Amino acid sequence: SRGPVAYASQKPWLLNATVEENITFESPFNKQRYKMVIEACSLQPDIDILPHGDQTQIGERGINLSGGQRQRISVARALYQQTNVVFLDDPFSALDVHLSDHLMQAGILELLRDDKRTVVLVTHKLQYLPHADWIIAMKDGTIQREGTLKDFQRSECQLFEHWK
Amino acid sequence: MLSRKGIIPEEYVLTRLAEDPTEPRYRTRERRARFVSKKGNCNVAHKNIREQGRFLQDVFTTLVDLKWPHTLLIFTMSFLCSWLLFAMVWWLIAFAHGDLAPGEGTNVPCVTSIHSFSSAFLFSIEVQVTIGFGGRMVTEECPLAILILIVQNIVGLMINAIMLGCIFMKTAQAHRRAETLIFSKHAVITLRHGRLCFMLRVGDLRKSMIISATIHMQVVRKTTSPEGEVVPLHQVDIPMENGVGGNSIFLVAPLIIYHVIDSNSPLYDLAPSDLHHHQDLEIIVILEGVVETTGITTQARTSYLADEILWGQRFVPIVAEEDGRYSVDYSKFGNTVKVPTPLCTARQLDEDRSLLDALTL
Amino acid sequence: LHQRAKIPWRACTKYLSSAGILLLSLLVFSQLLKHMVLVAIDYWLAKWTDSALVDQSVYAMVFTLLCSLGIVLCLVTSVTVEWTGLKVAKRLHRSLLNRIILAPMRFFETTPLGSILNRFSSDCNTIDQHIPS
Amino acid sequence: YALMVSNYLNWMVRNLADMEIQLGAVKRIHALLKTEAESYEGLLAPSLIPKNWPDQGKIQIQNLSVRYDSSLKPVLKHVNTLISPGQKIGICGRTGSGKSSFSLAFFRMVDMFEGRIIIDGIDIAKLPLHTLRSRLSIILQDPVLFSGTIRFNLDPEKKCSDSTLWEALEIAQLKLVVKALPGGLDAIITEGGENFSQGQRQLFCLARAFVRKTSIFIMDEATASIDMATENILQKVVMTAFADRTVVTIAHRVHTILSADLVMVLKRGAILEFDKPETLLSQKDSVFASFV
Numbered sequence: 001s002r003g004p005v006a007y008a009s010q011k012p013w014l015l016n017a018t019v020e021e022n023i024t025f026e027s028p029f030n031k032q033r034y035k036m037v038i039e040a041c042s043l044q045p046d047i048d049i050l051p052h053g054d055q056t057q058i059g060e061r062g063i064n065l066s067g068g069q070r071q072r073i074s075v076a077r078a079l080y081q082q083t084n085v086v087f088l089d090d091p092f093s094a095l096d097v098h099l100s101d102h103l104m105q106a107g108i109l110e111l112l113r114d115d116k117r118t119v120v121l122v123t124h125k126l127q128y129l130p131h132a133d134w135i136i137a138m139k140d141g142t143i144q145r146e147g148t149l150k151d152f153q154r155s156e157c158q159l160f161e162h163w164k
Numbered sequence: 165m166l167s168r169k170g171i172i173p174e175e176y177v178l179t180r181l182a183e184d185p186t187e188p189r190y191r192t193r194e195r196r197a198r199f200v201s202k203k204g205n206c207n208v209a210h211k212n213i214r215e216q217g218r219f220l221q222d223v224f225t226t227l228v229d230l231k232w233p234h235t236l237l238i239f240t241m242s243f244l245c246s247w248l249l250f251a252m253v254w255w256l257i258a259f260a261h262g263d264l265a266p267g268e269g270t271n272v273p274c275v276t277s278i279h280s281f282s283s284a285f286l287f288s289i290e291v292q293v294t295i296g297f298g299g300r301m302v303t304e305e306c307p308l309a310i311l312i313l314i315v316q317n318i319v320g321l322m323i324n325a326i327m328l329g330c331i332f333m334k335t336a337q338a339h340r341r342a343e344t345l346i347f348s349k350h351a352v353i354t355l356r357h358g359r360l361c362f363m364l365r366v367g368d369l370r371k372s373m374i375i376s377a378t379i380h381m382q383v384v385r386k387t388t389s390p391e392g393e394v395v396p397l398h399q400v401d402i403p404m405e406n407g408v409g410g411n412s413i414f415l416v417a418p419l420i421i422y423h424v425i426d427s428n429s430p431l432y433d434l435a436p437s438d439l440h441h442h443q444d445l446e447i448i449v450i451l452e453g454v455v456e457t458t459g460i461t462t463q464a465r466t467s468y469l470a471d472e473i474l475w476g477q478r479f480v481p482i483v484a485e486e487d488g489r490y491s492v493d494y495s496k497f498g499n500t501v502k503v504p505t506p507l508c509t510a511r512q513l514d515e516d517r518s519l520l521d522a523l524t525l
Numbered sequence: 526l527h528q529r530a531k532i533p534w535r536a537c538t539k540y541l542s543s544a545g546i547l548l549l550s551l552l553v554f555s556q557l558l559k560h561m562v563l564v565a566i567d568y569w570l571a572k573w574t575d576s577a578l579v580d581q582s583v584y585a586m587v588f589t590l591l592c593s594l595g596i597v598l599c600l601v602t603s604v605t606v607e608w609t610g611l612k613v614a615k616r617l618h619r620s621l622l623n624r625i626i627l628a629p630m631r632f633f634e635t636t637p638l639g640s641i642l643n644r645f646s647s648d649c650n651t652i653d654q655h656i657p658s
Numbered sequence: 659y660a661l662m663v664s665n666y667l668n669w670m671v672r673n674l675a676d677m678e679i680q681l682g683a684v685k686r687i688h689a690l691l692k693t694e695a696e697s698y699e700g701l702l703a704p705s706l707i708p709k710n711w712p713d714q715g716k717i718q719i720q721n722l723s724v725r726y727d728s729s730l731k732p733v734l735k736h737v738n739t740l741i742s743p744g745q746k747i748g749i750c751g752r753t754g755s756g757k758s759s760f761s762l763a764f765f766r767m768v769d770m771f772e773g774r775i776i777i778d779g780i781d782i783a784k785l786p787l788h789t790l791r792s793r794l795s796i797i798l799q800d801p802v803l804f805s806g807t808i809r810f811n812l813d814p815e816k817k818c819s820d821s822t823l824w825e826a827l828e829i830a831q832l833k834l835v836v837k838a839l840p841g842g843l844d845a846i847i848t849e850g851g852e853n854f855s856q857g858q859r860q861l862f863c864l865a866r867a868f869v870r871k872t873s874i875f876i877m878d879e880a881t882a883s884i885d886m887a888t889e890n891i892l893q894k895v896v897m898t899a900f901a902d903r904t905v906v907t908i909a910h911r912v913h914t915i916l917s918a919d920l921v922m923v924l925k926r927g928a929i930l931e932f933d934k935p936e937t938l939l940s941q942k943d944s945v946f947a948s949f950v
């Protein structure tokens with residue numbers, strides 16, 4: 001047995017259809033959960049320049065977008081699915097817009113903590129490296145530990161001053 | 165071959181961004197399906213009829229339903245085939261007997277004067293239609309022919325009796341009498357005695373009374389229950405607002421038929437704003453009764469779509485007394501005149517009256 | 526009405542403004558001339574077979590000429606259609622290139638940008654590689 | 659012959675149907691050829707009457723208004739903002755009205771021009787169109803590069819044989835990237851910037867500015883780039899103001915445009931506020947409040 005693990009990748013994957021279909025992804029469409037995610041992902045500026053907004057042909061065989069914009073679509077699609085576990089992968093290294101990231105974080109923190117949904121945010125976000133949220137560090141194909149974030153501070157090498 | 169596709173390769177070229185179909189998209193305003201047309205003729209087509217022959221098992225009902233020109237063809241074929249089926253019998257019997265040979269009549273012919281199949285055909289006409297010219301008699305020296313004379317008469321009598329019965333049920337057809345029962349093109353909604361109602365005018369053209377008239381009214385609309393049902397064409401009966409509750413009406417002059425819109429009506433929340441063309445609304449009116457001449461019951465079916473309703477209009481007077489009698493001026497049958505009426509729904513009208521009653525007391 | 530379009534107006538635009546007159550006429554001239562021979566060879570065979578069934582003569586050279594005329598006309602008709610089809614395809618593409626380049630940018634922004642692409646890749650392919658055949 | 663009629667009738671109708679669909683392709687292609695527009699001409703003598711190359715850049719707008727859809731719903735109303743000839747002037751608008759109308763009006767790309775313009779003192783409508791855009795450098799928002807030879811990339815129209823472009827290639831920006839291409843000046847492009855420095859678009863204009871004699875400089879917004887890239891633009895602006903003496907920068911980054919003689923903005927379909935100095939923008943803290 002297994003469950004519907006949510007996923008995102010460094011190389012974004014998109015559906016050459018309407019943007020709303022590229023976000024809902026064969027799932028029921030409710031504006032209540034819909035608006036809580038697009039505003040969180042700050043994709044409205046994209047729909048503020050596109051002619052039909054969500055109905056524009058996003059992806060290949062149609063409208064071509066920017067690298068950061070494709071990252072915005074990919075991260076938005078993961079949240080709407082309402083899955084018991086969620087995996088992200090470099091949504092902040094590919095696009096490093098400060099305002100976009102933190103609005104989703106407040107939406108991410110509220111839902112993921114309350115619903116007890118895992119969020120393995122594989123990224124280089126310096127702001128939230130230490131927190132009450134667990135961290136795991138890897139190097140040369142092995143994980144040092146999977147526990148509290150203060151455990152890194154208990155080591156001599158704190159990731160080279162932790163971007164002091 | 166003389167075809168461009170005689171030899172072609174496996175072709176695939178990316179027609180990048182094949183967009184803008186520019187489809188007409190005219191299906192939105194194509195048509196609004198009617199439940200029953202303005203002249204009966206229910207506009208409903210059935211599908212997946214798993215017939216087990218019951219279509220034709222009702223032969224005598226089917227024969228009557230057919231149009232008269234078709235009935236004449238069946239009338240003709242049923243008799244021409246019977247005459248010609250026994251024409252082959254008489255021709256063959258006289259062939260086997262041997263009196264068909266063109267020679268001296270040494271024997272006694274099986275059926276006299278049968279010389280050719282033409283004479284065999286004419287003799288078949290004489291026996292079945294009972295003309296009996298007598299040039300072609302039936303002799304006593306043919307025990308087989310006597311049997312066929314019995315068979316042809318019984319089949320001839322049986323065909324006639326069956327065919328007469330079908331014609332009598334077609335002569336008593338009263339679907340043509342139901343076409344002289346007239347309903348106005350558009351029904352109106354106006355205030356009567358302080359209460360809103362859905363008025364309508366129905367008239368009879370012929371001078372022959374239609375006995376035991378009975379008028380029914382139903383609303384055809386899609387209905388969703390609180391439990392979430394999906395009823396596509398729900399029919400809800402409408403009271404006639406008759407003084408005695410019953411549907412019985414006496415049709416001599418064109419009567420006004422109206423439904424008092426009380427709190428128990430399905431039209432209790434109809435506003436003139438929602439009376440446009442593409443509105444899920446229809447009122448079916450069914451006038452029944454037995455025609456005094458043939459005694460056969462009839463129906464006159466008419467329907468009013470939303471775009472065939474006229475809010476806040478009044479039916480013009482039609483009956484005017486003359487010197488020796490009354491007079492119905494049918495030119496003014498469907499004429500409507502505006503009336504001072506609220507533009508609010510029945511619920512708002514009741515609510516406004518409820519608030520006014522409390523303020524007065 | 527839009528669907529009902531026999532489209533004889535599009536054929537005239539292709540032939541008159543892109544093919545020419547010398548090449549267009551020889552295409553029509555060869556077709557009528559080729560099938561006139563095709564009737565003749567069959568007709569002359571009928572006369573040969575019917576008359577030779579024993580004035581008259583031996584049809585040992587006339588039938589060759591009709592066949593020789595027919596075989597050569599096949600080469601002429603085949604070359605002319607393909608050569609003319611090449612001329613229309615090449616010069617039409619140059620006209621389209623000289624128009625889009627010398628066109629305002631307002632139309633490019635308004636257009637879906639696939640309408641120009643389709644009429645440039647899919648449509649030009651059918652005109653170039655199918656109409657001559 | 660009667661035997662062969664069966665398939666002659668079949669393939670007559672069959673080929674006819676297949677031809678009609680393919681004839682529709684001729685209908686659609688010829689429809690695009692019916693888009694007869696972009697009249698390239700000049701309503702005057704264009705040989706010696708206009709300036710050979712605008713150098714002063716004294717363009718004083720006089721009641722010019724631009725609207726695209728048949729001169730309807732204009733975003734500008736009698737635009738008359740005096741730029742500074744012989745010196746740099748950077749006018750940045752918060753919204754698109756400041757730059758979108760200006761960029762089109764500089765190169766006559768705007769669909770409608772209600773009025774007239776004076777390019778270096780000479781009219782704009784009475785000048786060659788190719789020469790109009792040949793000596794007016796401009797940057798765009800998104801990085802746009804083609805795939806072709808560098809020698810035919812920086813100056814394909816000019817086709818300048820001077821090797822200073824190669825010297826400028828390692829001097830203007832991306833000194834190491836020039837060495838990364840073994841060909842150098844004659845090297846071809848590599849997949850149109852699949853893996854290349856983000857300053858390629860700005861560097862391309864640097865070679866274009868020096869080669870095409872682009873005395874007047876135009877600018878636009880920025881999507882995403884390094885902070886030091888803006889600093890490199892500042893040095894080029896100083897050199898442009900010192901040597902070329904004409905510059906018109908349009909963007910929405912207030913601090914970068916602050917290093918300019920003047921600054922303007924057009925808002926709500928007309929001009930919002932013009933300031934002869936740049937500190938006058940900071941004098942009105944309201945516009946600085948909108949910026950940050």
Ligand SMILES: CCCCCCCCCCCCCCCCCC(=O)OC[C@H](COP(=O)(O)OC[C@H](N)C(=O)O)OC(=O)CCCCCCCCCCCCCCCCC
Nearest residue numbers: 228229230231232233234236237239240244334337339340
């Ligand atoms: C998709 C296309 C479908 C087309 C379907 C229709 C096909 C029609 C065929 C046309 C030729 C028919 C000729 C018939 C001539 C007599 C009938 C006639 O004149 O009409 C008078 C009418 C029939 O009219 P209707 O409107 O069709 O009636 C339908 C009826 N109201 C109903 O629906 O209910 O009838 C009456 O009102 C009845 C009176 C009958 C009295 C006349 C006696 C004639 C007897 C037969 C004589 C001819 C014998 C020929 C023998 C030949 C032997 C070799």
Ligand SMILES: CCOc1cc(CC(=O)N[C@@H](CC(C)C)c2ccccc2N2CCCCC2)ccc1C(=O)O
Nearest residue numbers: 165166167168169170171172173665668669672673676
């Ligand atoms: C769309 C293709 O679907 C078809 C498929 C078939 C079956 C078939 O053998 N086809 C090829 C034959 C081979 C040699 C290319 C063909 C294609 C075009 C014209 C004629 C033919 N030959 C047909 C058989 C007799 C000789 C000529 C028939 C007809 C069709 C059809 O258009 O309906």
Ligand SMILES: Nc1ncnc2c1ncn2[C@@H]1O[C@H](COP(=O)(O)OP(=O)(O)OP(=O)(O)O)[C@@H](O)[C@H]1O
Nearest residue numbers: 209210211212213214215216217218219220221222
């Ligand atoms: N399409 C149809 N056409 C005619 N009669 C039908 C049709 N569908 C159902 N009926 C009639 O409805 C009755 C049974 O309907 P229902 O569909 O509930 O059962 P059923 O399992 O299809 O019946 P059965 O096996 O007896 O035909 C029978 O009298 C059957 O003749």
